[PDB]
Amino acid sequence: MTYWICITNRENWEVIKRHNVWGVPKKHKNTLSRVKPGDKLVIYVRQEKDKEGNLLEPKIVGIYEVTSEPYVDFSRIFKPHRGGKETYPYRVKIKPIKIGEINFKPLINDLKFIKNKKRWSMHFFGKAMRELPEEDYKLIEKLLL
Numbered sequence: 001m002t003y004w005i006c007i008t009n010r011e012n013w014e015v016i017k018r019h020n021v022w023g024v025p026k027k028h029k030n031t032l033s034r035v036k037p038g039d040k041l042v043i044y045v046r047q048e049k050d051k052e053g054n055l056l057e058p059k060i061v062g063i064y065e066v067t068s069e070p071y072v073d074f075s076r077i078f079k080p081h082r083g084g085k086e087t088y089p090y091r092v093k094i095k096p097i098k099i100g101e102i103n104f105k106p107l108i109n110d111l112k113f114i115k116n117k118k119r120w121s122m123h124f125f126g127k128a129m130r131e132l133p134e135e136d137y138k139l140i141e142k143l144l145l
């Protein structure tokens, strides 16, 4: 088995919850190809701003379990996160395990995958998902009420 942290935003988090699909663009297809049924996905949403300019801190919002092998499907369900026409066609089916909401920032000091504590964001930049050490998954699972 393998644990992963998946990077998305609030709008697509809603799509994920409704469709039970985790998808990534072509540049990250190689990483997704390693995912197998049974794997756990920690869902993370980046920092955003609401319409009134209020900052929405980065959060862990849930844990899902992978239920299918990777597949390809170009159905338009996600909102292109950078304003393009991206469909995030390479996907796995998933099912919910846990739905919650905890701030991510206070956790960096204790998350092993964050090697560079001073600029933790570098571990998320240009990535859709990355493997989580078992210890990191265990800590997040316990904290996500």
Ligand SMILES: [Ca+2]
Pocket: 082, 084, 085, 086
């Ligand atoms: Ca694009």
Ligand SMILES: [Ca+2]
Pocket: 025, 026, 084, 086
């Ligand atoms: Ca693209």
